[PDB]
Design a binder for this molecule. Sequence first.
Ligand SMILES: *[C@H](C)[C@H]1/C(=C/c2[nH]c(/C=C3N=C(/C=C4\NC(=O)C(CC)=C4C)C(C)=C\3CCC(=O)O)c(CCC(=O)O)c2C)NC(=O)[C@@H]1C
Ligand SMILES: *[C@H](C)[C@H]1/C(=C/c2[nH]c(/C=C3N=C(/C=C4\NC(=O)C(CC)=C4C)C(C)=C\3CCC(=O)O)c(CCC(=O)O)c2C)NC(=O)[C@@H]1C
Ligand SMILES: *[C@H](C)[C@H]1/C(=C/c2[nH]c(/C=C3N=C(/C=C4\NC(=O)C(CC)=C4C)C(C)=C\3CCC(=O)O)c(CCC(=O)O)c2C)NC(=O)[C@@H]1C
Ligand SMILES: *[C@H](C)[C@H]1/C(=C/c2[nH]c(/C=C3N=C(/C=C4\NC(=O)C(CC)=C4C)C(C)=C\3CCC(=O)O)c(CCC(=O)O)c2C)NC(=O)[C@@H]1C
Ligand SMILES: *[C@H](C)[C@H]1/C(=C/c2[nH]c(/C=C3N=C(/C=C4\NC(=O)C(CC)=C4C)C(C)=C\3CCC(=O)O)c(CCC(=O)O)c2C)NC(=O)[C@@H]1C
Ligand SMILES: *[C@H](C)[C@H]1/C(=C/c2[nH]c(/C=C3N=C(/C=C4\NC(=O)C(CC)=C4C)C(C)=C\3CCC(=O)O)c(CCC(=O)O)c2C)NC(=O)[C@@H]1C
Ligand SMILES: *[C@H](C)[C@H]1/C(=C/c2[nH]c(/C=C3N=C(/C=C4\NC(=O)C(CC)=C4C)C(C)=C\3CCC(=O)O)c(CCC(=O)O)c2C)NC(=O)[C@@H]1C
Ligand SMILES: *[C@H](C)[C@H]1/C(=C/c2[nH]c(/C=C3N=C(/C=C4\NC(=O)C(CC)=C4C)C(C)=C\3CCC(=O)O)c(CCC(=O)O)c2C)NC(=O)[C@@H]1C
Ligand SMILES: *[C@H](C)[C@H]1/C(=C/c2[nH]c(/C=C3N=C(/C=C4\NC(=O)C(CC)=C4C)C(C)=C\3CCC(=O)O)c(CCC(=O)O)c2C)NC(=O)[C@@H]1C
Lengths: 66, 161, 161, 161, 161, 161, 160, 160, 160, 159, 48
Amino acid sequence: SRYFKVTACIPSLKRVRTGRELQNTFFTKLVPYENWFTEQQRIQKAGGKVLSVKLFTGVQGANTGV
Amino acid sequence: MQDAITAVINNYDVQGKYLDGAALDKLKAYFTTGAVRVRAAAVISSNATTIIKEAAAKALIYSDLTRPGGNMYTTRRYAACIRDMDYFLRYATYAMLAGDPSILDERVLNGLKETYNSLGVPIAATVGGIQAMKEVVGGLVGPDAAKEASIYFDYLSSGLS
Amino acid sequence: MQDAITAVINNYDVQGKYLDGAALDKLKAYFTTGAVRVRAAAVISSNATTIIKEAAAKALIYSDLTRPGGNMYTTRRYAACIRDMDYFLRYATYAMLAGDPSILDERVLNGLKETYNSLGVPIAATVGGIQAMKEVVGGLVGPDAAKEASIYFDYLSSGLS
Amino acid sequence: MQDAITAVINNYDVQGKYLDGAALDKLKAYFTTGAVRVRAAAVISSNATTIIKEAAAKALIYSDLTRPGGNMYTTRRYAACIRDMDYFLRYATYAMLAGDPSILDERVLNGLKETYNSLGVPIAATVGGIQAMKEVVGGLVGPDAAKEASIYFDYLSSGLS
Amino acid sequence: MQDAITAVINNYDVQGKYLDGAALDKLKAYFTTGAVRVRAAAVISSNATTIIKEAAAKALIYSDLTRPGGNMYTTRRYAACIRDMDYFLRYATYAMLAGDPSILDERVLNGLKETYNSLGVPIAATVGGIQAMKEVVGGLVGPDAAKEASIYFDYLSSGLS
Amino acid sequence: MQDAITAVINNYDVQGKYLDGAALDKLKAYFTTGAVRVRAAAVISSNATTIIKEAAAKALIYSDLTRPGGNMYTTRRYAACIRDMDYFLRYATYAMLAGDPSILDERVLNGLKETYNSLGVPIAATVGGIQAMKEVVGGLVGPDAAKEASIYFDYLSSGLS
Amino acid sequence: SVLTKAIVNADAEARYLSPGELDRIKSFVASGERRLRIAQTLTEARERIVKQAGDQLFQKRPDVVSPGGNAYGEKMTALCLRDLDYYLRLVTYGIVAGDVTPIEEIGIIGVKEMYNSLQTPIPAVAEGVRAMKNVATSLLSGDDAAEAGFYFDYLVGAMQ
Amino acid sequence: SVLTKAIVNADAEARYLSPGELDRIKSFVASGERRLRIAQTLTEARERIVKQAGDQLFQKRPDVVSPGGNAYGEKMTALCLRDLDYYLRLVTYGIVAGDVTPIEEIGIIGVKEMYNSLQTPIPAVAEGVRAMKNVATSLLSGDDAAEAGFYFDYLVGAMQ
Amino acid sequence: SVLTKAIVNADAEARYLSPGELDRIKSFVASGERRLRIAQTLTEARERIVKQAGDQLFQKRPDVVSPGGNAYGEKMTALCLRDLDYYLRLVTYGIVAGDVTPIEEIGIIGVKEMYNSLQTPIPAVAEGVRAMKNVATSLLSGDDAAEAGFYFDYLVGAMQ
Amino acid sequence: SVLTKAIVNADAEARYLSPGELDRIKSFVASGERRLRIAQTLTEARERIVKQAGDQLFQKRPDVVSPGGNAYGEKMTALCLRDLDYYLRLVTYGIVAGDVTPIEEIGIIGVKEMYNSLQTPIPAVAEGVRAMKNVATSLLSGDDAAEAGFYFDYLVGAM
Amino acid sequence: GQSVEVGVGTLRRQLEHIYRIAPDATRSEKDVAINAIYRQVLDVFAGI
Ligand SMILES: *[C@H](C)[C@H]1/C(=C/c2[nH]c(/C=C3N=C(/C=C4\NC(=O)C(CC)=C4C)C(C)=C\3CCC(=O)O)c(CCC(=O)O)c2C)NC(=O)[C@@H]1C
Ligand SMILES: *[C@H](C)[C@H]1/C(=C/c2[nH]c(/C=C3N=C(/C=C4\NC(=O)C(CC)=C4C)C(C)=C\3CCC(=O)O)c(CCC(=O)O)c2C)NC(=O)[C@@H]1C
Ligand SMILES: *[C@H](C)[C@H]1/C(=C/c2[nH]c(/C=C3N=C(/C=C4\NC(=O)C(CC)=C4C)C(C)=C\3CCC(=O)O)c(CCC(=O)O)c2C)NC(=O)[C@@H]1C
Ligand SMILES: *[C@H](C)[C@H]1/C(=C/c2[nH]c(/C=C3N=C(/C=C4\NC(=O)C(CC)=C4C)C(C)=C\3CCC(=O)O)c(CCC(=O)O)c2C)NC(=O)[C@@H]1C
Ligand SMILES: *[C@H](C)[C@H]1/C(=C/c2[nH]c(/C=C3N=C(/C=C4\NC(=O)C(CC)=C4C)C(C)=C\3CCC(=O)O)c(CCC(=O)O)c2C)NC(=O)[C@@H]1C
Ligand SMILES: *[C@H](C)[C@H]1/C(=C/c2[nH]c(/C=C3N=C(/C=C4\NC(=O)C(CC)=C4C)C(C)=C\3CCC(=O)O)c(CCC(=O)O)c2C)NC(=O)[C@@H]1C
Ligand SMILES: *[C@H](C)[C@H]1/C(=C/c2[nH]c(/C=C3N=C(/C=C4\NC(=O)C(CC)=C4C)C(C)=C\3CCC(=O)O)c(CCC(=O)O)c2C)NC(=O)[C@@H]1C
Ligand SMILES: *[C@H](C)[C@H]1/C(=C/c2[nH]c(/C=C3N=C(/C=C4\NC(=O)C(CC)=C4C)C(C)=C\3CCC(=O)O)c(CCC(=O)O)c2C)NC(=O)[C@@H]1C
Ligand SMILES: *[C@H](C)[C@H]1/C(=C/c2[nH]c(/C=C3N=C(/C=C4\NC(=O)C(CC)=C4C)C(C)=C\3CCC(=O)O)c(CCC(=O)O)c2C)NC(=O)[C@@H]1C
């Protein structure tokens, strides 16, 4: 399956949190292609900015094996 | 995101200035436009499916894209493209109500370029589709609304290109 | 991932061409090889533990690596290295059945070099281990199977290096 | 994380050497310092709120930052900044007990620069605040403890800058 | 949840009947009461902290409960009790706006008795607190609003007991 | 959970009484027993695997249970039973250090009977196994420790039955 | 209803109603009496609205009332008209509520699935609702019509 | 703002704006011109409102302006008045927005934490806001005052 | 208590007690007899510690015992002293337990919320505890005082 | 180490170190000097401890050093002794640290897997460690021996 | 009269430990978290 490597930064505008949030704030992650759409939306809704997106696995414009 | 009213407020807040007449005038301008915008939004929501259909017919379909080896070939890709078209329409409607382009930047425009480049989706074709939607929308909304609607569609197009 | 049969299909699908005799011949070629491959895979699965043991004995153990200050020193690191060896073996077996190198690229090969460089794992030693596994595997599978098995092992080695 | 005792152990382990008198001396040195450190830590914990208050008064407040258009303007941002200050203090206290700067690198220092740059938080001002906290802490802990405390504060400052 | 307007609608929907004048009259009745209710709700929200304080002073505090061996003894338990009081107030305000007791049944009343019995919280004391809040609320809201407010408070009390 | 020291404290706290000599004597009693308990716990941890083995040999194995159609027949079930045995041992050790049976009630005892009845695990056989573990443990810990250890084992047995 | 929606948002946030939310409630209660009249008008004209809309729909879509089509035959045509009547009743409920929620629970959730099992074409149903809107608009005064239009538009949007 | 709130709810639901939501937007745009005037009035009277409210607060709470108290001394008293001014500016922003959201982001989130570090008493701050409300109410017409009151009340509720 | 804390950490890890953990338990049981005496001393001097600390607190904070202040009046002053007594009892419990957990459950969780409803200033309460520490320290021997100080410091840290 | 463990628990809770935790740190620093001596003793006697333990193990298990057995042959026997030496070094590290964590990372995680690939019998490795404990105990004073025993026992438990 | 452990009680709190994986964290730290993930999702209450 196609996989996405995503780097994004998210700010906590609603509430101040005592516990360390640094992992949540800046998170380079591998996302399944199917999941990424929803994940991208979630980052946008948070007001976080997605710094970089790359397709880690799979071939672009492949009809099958996707 | 921001709206026109909040945008004025935010600019004043960073200055620390109390709201002034010049600021008030901008707010007043928005308030008059508001009623028109609400009517336009309702029109778009009701005709959304058709708007997408017409726009696709104008640009996307009966083309190399739909033919094998084209980006929108296969049902899965076709469905994806029309889903994206719907997104653009919904967000443009939101922007029109808001009176501010910022929401487009915050939600639609951010990260889309990178996604599309990895996917190999063709930007110019997408832009073409957006422009087509604009034309269809312009008709339905009418004169009062079309000018307002057009700017947000153009904003999306400029961002992508 | 992709397999030989699907690879042929995919190539035809992008062309939009119906399957033709030339394509059929490639598929037919695969089908004859298939029976041999299945036998080889069963041999490898049964002897997997031993294959790894022999290969480690040939290259990894009794070396500076295992001695203190070496990358495979400490139980944790030793265990990691043999786990990696198992991965390579399992994936090579999968590739041999599939008749396609793509799975190796999609799962094993992608990002491995970078991971290893950050970790400070020595690539050349790893490659040596893969080559050792190949030699052991070649014996067990027998000559006809060995040629097929060897290409996937070599593919892994080339990717890492 | 790592501590002074474990750091010595780890250095010996990579060499494979058994612990020797020279190593023992370093460990012994730490053990004498330990009692002082514990006392200092208790002082800091009790006076933590005040330390932050004093440091903010020295650098952060009555400044452009707090004024509209400044990074620490608005209650939300003000609260965030003092939360960050508390983090630095708590981690420095942990480091002082540990006798090792590693924990600062592993938790606080890693990714902070990048986070701050995206946020638009000013690093130099933050560093200023850390230095201010150091000065306040130095007083409370007393001279012997102050030297030990200072190095960790300086380490944080250098990392951020 | 349900509100008065929706309750009328739902009754008609099960009958399948179109809305009729008698139904309209009930809706009209609600609409007149509405303005009063909105004013009352704003009063309660602003004075919520004080309302709770006064009610606690009237019943809960200076009592065996707060004394050691009492349910509200210890900070944790004290805080829990005032949190519960706040819940009751917020939900009663919601019910007053809605004009329907159903939300109280759906959220607050359901399972509360069982929870309290397991916890060993005393129901009668809780009821006493609710009644006290009602009295304080009655004053602030004023007489016309008080009658409406009282019924929801009484509903909560009856449910718990 | 609770421990002996905290149990004394809690009894005094509900009374609101400051700690008194009689209370102190109970605490002092615990402190003397403490050293023995720590030694016993270390013995049990080291010999845990063997304790389970011996107890199983005494009761569980060479029995109808292990024979086909028995609850402990099949590897999966056998493994489950020895896992449960380990749980009981670990918790009993915790209880012995604590000097209080409460942890057993909170973690092990709660809902176990019901779980076992649904599963069809035989309670009496399990109890037998616990008693067997007790006997083995008694030997290793030595007499003074054994009395203390026995009470917690008996507590588990009584709870299950 | 408006009020239910506001309360629900507040409960999610675990806060008392915001001033803005309160203001909307105030506006709604003032509007209600006008809304009641709009609903009453449509109820009285219900029978004719349905009849006129049906005819328009059948003219716009000959296929639906054709041997192949789902609507074809007396039984089927009656059911199609009954459906139009149902949607009109829902719209009236919506106007009094001031929100689509009442409409939504009864009519718009699972609608696609229901019609797909029936094999009724969803677009044709939408056209029928559009037709009903036009008839209803004519009887209503302009401002009243705009209010009614929003609810009608929602239905058309939902069934799409 | 009202509009921002509506859009955000729609986006979460991933739907176009509901008719009810659209209606509230319509009401808001009509109200806006009145709202602008209310805001303008308070801006002009800003300096006096702050001054009068300050005096009232100090009379109600002698302690705050006492050697122990935080407000005591010229520098400190100025800062207390500056804070009151800040809150008034926020309230004006709120009235034009028609929602507390603008107010909330700038002033009400983390307010407790900020004041606790400062050691300023939160209840006294609330009293100051209450005082400002009373002054503002007097200058405003009754209906205008009610609108303004809601925003003032929210602030008082937030700082509690 | 120390033992409870150790067990809890082990259970989270799902392991038998570590040697290091066992060693800490051993140290604690040896320390206990000394700890018991320290606690006994404070209990005997309890009445005077509270009285002296109260006076110091009132000198430090005139405001609390002033008509505005919460502590003002005989009833209120008694309650303030009762609170100080409560905290002292908790500290004694802590010393015997060897951990703050007993103290923490009874006194430090929800303390902010309780005092905020009461409107008692949290910093003043902290000062009272500090005052009690100083009195207690004087009666205790130096080493004993250090042990007691840690528990006193924790309380001050918890509530500020 | 003790200190690392305490800090880690505090960081998870996001709190400053508890008094109880601080007390444990104090106890540890006092103990450390004694601990250093215990470690030093074992280091000096290392060579003999390993040798004596090895002999005991070989007497206990003739099979391992037999033509069939893994340990058989000089090369293999040396490797078995080297392993015993490794474990002793780990134990000394543990004593100075006051915690098993240093031991655990280097020696106890993945140990099963490593030995299973080697085919070395684990239930005899454990015996070797037990043997080393007995030798070490004799050289150590009683109280010192008890401290050392705990670490030795942990190793035996871990396998 | 009631005791500290009466309502919610002490135990449930303090048997919850937030776990965050850190890149530089030592293996044993990391594994403990990993084990807990398995523990909660797959209900492996042995906990390994
Ligand atoms: C024939 C059985 C029915 C029918 C067909 C019909 N299709 C279109 C238009 C398109 N159909 C497709 C379909 C595909 N493209 C793909 O890549 C795949 C997967 C391999 C499929 C199945 C596409 C993409 C189009 C768009 C136009 C194009 O050819 O590029 C039409 C015309 C569309 C219109 O609305 O005018 C029609 C009529 N329709 C029926 O009624 C038949 C039952
Ligand atoms: C249609 C006009 C064009 C087209 C569309 C197309 N898109 C994808 C895949 C994705 N599109 C997006 C877009 C968005 N992400 C967001 O966050 C937003 C804002 C709400 C948008 C608009 C994303 C994330 C993806 C990837 C994930 C997913 O599939 O949902 C495809 C599929 C590409 C592929 O085959 O791999 C297609 C076809 N492509 C065209 O050619 C048209 C010009
Ligand atoms: C007056 C009603 C009360 C009072 C106020 C007071 N405030 C300060 C100091 C500050 N207050 C603020 C407040 C804000 N900054 C913001 O961004 C916002 C939201 C828009 C607010 C409300 C800040 C940042 C400061 C710090 C100083 C600075 O800004 O430069 C003081 C000074 C006290 C001190 O110790 O410094 C005072 C006295 N005090 C009272 O007792 C009154 C009830
Ligand atoms: C105070 C001296 C300066 C300041 C601070 C400030 N920080 C933020 C936001 C964040 N700060 C952090 C930092 C950390 N989180 C961690 O876990 C750690 C390590 C333990 C650190 C150091 C993070 C992650 C955030 C983002 C989300 C959050 O609230 O934690 C802000 C707010 C930025 C915003 O606009 O939201 C501020 C103001 N800024 C200054 O002006 C001071 C110089
Ligand atoms: C023979 C190849 C090897 C060997 C066997 C051996 N087994 C035992 C004891 C038991 N073995 C089992 C096994 C099973 N129970 C099941 O349900 C299944 C799957 C269906 C199996 C495989 C059990 C349960 C026991 C315990 C006794 C009982 O049946 O109740 C022993 C005896 C050991 C003892 O002390 O109990 C032995 C010797 N051991 C070897 O050395 C051979 C290589
Ligand atoms: C061994 C002496 C006896 C035995 C054990 C046995 N247990 C199971 C299955 C389960 N046992 C439990 C027990 C617990 N779960 C908990 O959460 C707790 C307390 C916190 C306990 C003690 C549970 C829940 C199960 C089911 C799922 C699981 O095993 O994780 C079995 C197997 C039953 C099955 O069908 O899977 C066995 C064999 N049974 C005997 O006959 C011995 C006397
Ligand atoms: C003294 C330093 C400060 C002070 C004290 C004060 N307290 C109250 C009222 C209460 N105090 C408590 C506190 C506790 N209950 C507990 O369970 C514990 C821990 C064991 C504590 C510390 C409670 C519950 C009350 C409520 C009344 C009651 O006990 O029934 C008051 C009066 C309350 C009022 O005026 O409303 C006072 C004055 N106040 C200060 O300002 C001093 C600095
Ligand atoms: C002696 C008690 C037993 C025994 C020994 C034995 N060991 C090996 C081989 C290896 N031992 C290790 C183990 C470690 N490496 C580490 O880093 C650590 C932690 C510090 C340990 C414990 C390793 C890596 C090897 C592999 C070879 C090498 O050292 O490079 C052998 C040889 C293996 C073989 O089968 O040829 C032997 C014989 N064997 C027994 O039977 C005794 C019970
Ligand atoms: C105060 C008037 C009285 C009082 C209350 C009290 N309650 C608890 C604990 C709980 N109370 C609830 C109740 C609710 N949960 C809900 O969802 C609702 C409906 C919105 C209610 C009212 C629950 C579930 C708990 C337990 C969970 C929790 O505390 O978060 C306590 C303390 C019990 C404890 O051990 O913490 C108390 C004291 N008791 C009195 O003495 C007053 C008469």
